[PDB]
Amino acid sequence: EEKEILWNEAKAFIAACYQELGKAAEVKDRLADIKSEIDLTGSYVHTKEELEHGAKMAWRNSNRCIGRLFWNSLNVIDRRDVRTKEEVRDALFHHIETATNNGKIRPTITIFPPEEKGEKQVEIWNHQLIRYAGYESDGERIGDPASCSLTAACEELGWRGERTDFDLLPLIFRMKGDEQPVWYELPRSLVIEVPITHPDIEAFSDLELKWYGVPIISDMKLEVGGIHYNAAPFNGWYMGTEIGARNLADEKRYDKLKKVASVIGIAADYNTDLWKDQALVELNKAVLHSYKKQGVSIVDHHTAASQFKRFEEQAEEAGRKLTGDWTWLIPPISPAATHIFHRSYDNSIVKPNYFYQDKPYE
Amino acid sequence: EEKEILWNEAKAFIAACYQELGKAAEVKDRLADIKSEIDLTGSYVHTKEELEHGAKMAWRNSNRCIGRLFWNSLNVIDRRDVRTKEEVRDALFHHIETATNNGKIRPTITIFPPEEKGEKQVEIWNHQLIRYAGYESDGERIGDPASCSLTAACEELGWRGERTDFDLLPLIFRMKGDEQPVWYELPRSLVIEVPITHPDIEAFSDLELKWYGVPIISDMKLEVGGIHYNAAPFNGWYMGTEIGARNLADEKRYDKLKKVASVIGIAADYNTDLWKDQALVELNKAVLHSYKKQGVSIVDHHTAASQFKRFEEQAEEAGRKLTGDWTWLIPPISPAATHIFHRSYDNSIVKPNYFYQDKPYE
Numbered sequence A, B: 001e002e003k004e005i006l007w008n009e010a011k012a013f014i015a016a017c018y019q020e021l022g023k024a025a026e027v028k029d030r031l032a033d034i035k036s037e038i039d040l041t042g043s044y045v046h047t048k049e050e051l052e053h054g055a056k057m058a059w060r061n062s063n064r065c066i067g068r069l070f071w072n073s074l075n076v077i078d079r080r081d082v083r084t085k086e087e088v089r090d091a092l093f094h095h096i097e098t099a100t101n102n103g104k105i106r107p108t109i110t111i112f113p114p115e116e117k118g119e120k121q122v123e124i125w126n127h128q129l130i131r132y133a134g135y136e137s138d139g140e141r142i143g144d145p146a147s148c149s150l151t152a153a154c155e156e157l158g159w160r161g162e163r164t165d166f167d168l169l170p171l172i173f174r175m176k177g178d179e180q181p182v183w184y185e186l187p188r189s190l191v192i193e194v195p196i197t198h199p200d201i202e203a204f205s206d207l208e209l210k211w212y213g214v215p216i217i218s219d220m221k222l223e224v225g226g227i228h229y230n231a232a233p234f235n236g237w238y239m240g241t242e243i244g245a246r247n248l249a250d251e252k253r254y255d256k257l258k259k260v261a262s263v264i265g266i267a268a269d270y271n272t273d274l275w276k277d278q279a280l281v282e283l284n285k286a287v288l289h290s291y292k293k294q295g296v297s298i299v300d301h302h303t304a305a306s307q308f309k310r311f312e313e314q315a316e317e318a319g320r321k322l323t324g325d326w327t328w329l330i331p332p333i334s335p336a337a338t339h340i341f342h343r344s345y346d347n348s349i350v351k352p353n354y355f356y357q358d359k360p361y362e
């Protein structure tokens, strides 16, 4: 059964991947080979080409991603060789550096060894590689609530944050055979960060907001032809709204709108003033401007959605069915000003793809 | 079969309605009575109490309505007696007047005679009772595009708009047995309208925006215990965002954002300025302010969503399952600033309810 699901995912996967790559004749033989390898080993190993392209497909089938126009240019780094924690840490450091590229961000994915009998070789605990600690000590909230549980896990283990609102979490992961993960402080030279300033309103700096340059999702599994790469951290660049509208705005995260409001000189007393809407727009403007001012790559949600419309034309022109989760594609501000809003999307799962998995802390 | 679906909807309906009204013992007998009436007539007639409460339930089960907190106070007007077009017109005029209430708007529904063998007694063509004409004469767009097809139907029939951007459409409906509908010009004394002005920016009047006070959906069917009231126009008051974010903003409707932008003294050249977001917020502010300034009832989307949260607590406290279409509940601006956004809703159909039906023009 295990063999059988694996075998089928593999057949589907190879046929489609080789078809896309104009390598259709080579399929019979490659499958034969795989049929033997799974017969013998109970698994099979991807070629470099298969793995690069699988990862590309997985991004392309990510229903919740608006920035899939650029799926085919994903930078794929194949680290299936790593056996030691030093190599993992160092692969992680490298990915941060190469993806950041001095602020001209490259969409990158580092792929570590797959699961064996569903036995993990590496288990990355961070949610993102770069992320801020969250504390809560008797109703004194500090930093990022979303990170509270992970943060108290690190602290268990030895780490100690400075309790700033933007403490950098360390990398923390576990190796097959170890009962505990290790952690390693993030070198600061690696992490680009941006202060938030407004183009017009100088008192805006008084807020002392900043955010990190690159979002690198480090806790989703990549599945490709029945192979489960549980550790395969990936990145793009940010759409502004995720910083300015979620991370900084949500009540459960940084909860900045009142302060935004106060410092932009509007009152926060009456819903009918639309002071949250208005703050949200100045804050999202502050975000794009600061990242563009710093030479760090970013997209606004309007631009992003025009990109995603090209993606839609291109799927269909390529004869590919489109999938999409409307609830995630629409941006959290001015969604009706994007075409995404006015159409519907088929939310089926096509593999290859990225998937959630259980957190090991909690 | 017809009898059978009708009979079952009826059983479900009566049991639930009488249960809610503490009239559970009276059910056996009322059903017996109905069983006879459908045996004989092929249909059955609602009591005043059943009909009032059915209409209330239908609003309560309207998954796409954020303003369901007020379902139980719906004003129900029972016009199952009307036989003539003069009575229909006059029922319509009355509803406009009584629902408007000098701007203190009363949620009201006028219920005309049901379908017979699915044969309509009255067929209302308007989408809303109060709505603006749309023209398009060789790439000269006038008024409201959404109304283009209806408008050319009236014009067929004799009506002639002044070709302003806010021409009032006439009432137009058809009576069983007539091959054509009639139309009747809307008396102007009946229709409250609001000019849009900004609280701060006086040049805002230069835009010469206005909108009508009361939205009255006149082309959906109400179903109650298997009875199909195809003509049962209903109203609430407006959430600002529907005017300020859809009606006035969408490209396919009035398409005002550039102009908004120009008159609020920001440039409309770069997506990264968030000039659509910013215009949308000043325009939605202009809308609430003008309606509150005029003594016309309106709700902002934040207030609305806090109301809808009480509705959610109240369903559950009453032991009722909640339903909801997330895609409609979220507002089209600052949706992530409402709790609606951060939860999910079950989109099943529970009857009684309001439903779409085929347009007769087009």
Ligand code: HEM
Residues within 6 Å of the ligand: A058, A059, A062, A064, A065, A066, A067, A068, A070, A074, A107, A108, A109, A234, A235, A236, A237, A238, A239, A242, A299, A328, A354
């Ligand atoms: C190049 C720039 C990129 C942009 C601007 C972008 C934008 C986004 C945004 C805005 C979301 C919504 C997520 C949220 O609301 O938290 C998202 C989700 C996602 N994106 Fe992308 N993305 C990019 C690159 C990538 C890459 C490189 C991959 C994979 C290789 C990817 C896979 C996904 C996935 C799987 C999700 C859903 C994640 C989840 O469940 O939380 N995207 N994307």
Ligand code: HEM
Residues within 6 Å of the ligand: B058, B059, B062, B064, B065, B066, B067, B068, B070, B074, B107, B108, B109, B234, B235, B236, B237, B238, B239, B242, B299, B328, B354
């Ligand atoms: C009292 C104030 C009311 C407010 C503020 C309100 C608000 C809304 C809003 C904002 C929508 C979204 C529709 C759109 O995006 O076009 C909506 C939909 C709807 N509401 Fe309400 N509503 C109210 C009263 C009513 C009443 C009285 C009824 C029925 C008796 C009702 C039934 C519905 C239905 C059926 C829909 C979906 C209509 C469609 O498919 O286009 N609501 N409501």
Ligand SMILES: O=[N+]([O-])c1cccc2c(Br)n[nH]c12
Residues within 6 Å of the ligand: A215, A216, A217, A234, A235, A236, A237, A238, A239, A240, A241, A242, A243
């Ligand atoms: O840009 N975003 O707001 C955003 C959200 C979630 C995941 C990603 C990645 Br991987 N690149 N950008 C992202």
Ligand SMILES: O=[N+]([O-])c1cccc2c(Br)n[nH]c12
Residues within 6 Å of the ligand: B215, B216, B217, B234, B235, B236, B237, B238, B239, B240, B241, B242, B243
């Ligand atoms: O207020 N709204 O934006 C809105 C939208 C659609 C239907 C209705 C009614 Br009936 N009252 N208010 C409505």
Ligand SMILES: [Cl-]
Residues within 6 Å of the ligand: A215, A242, A247
């Ligand atoms: Cl993020």
Ligand SMILES: [Cl-]
Residues within 6 Å of the ligand: B215, B242, B247
């Ligand atoms: Cl409307």
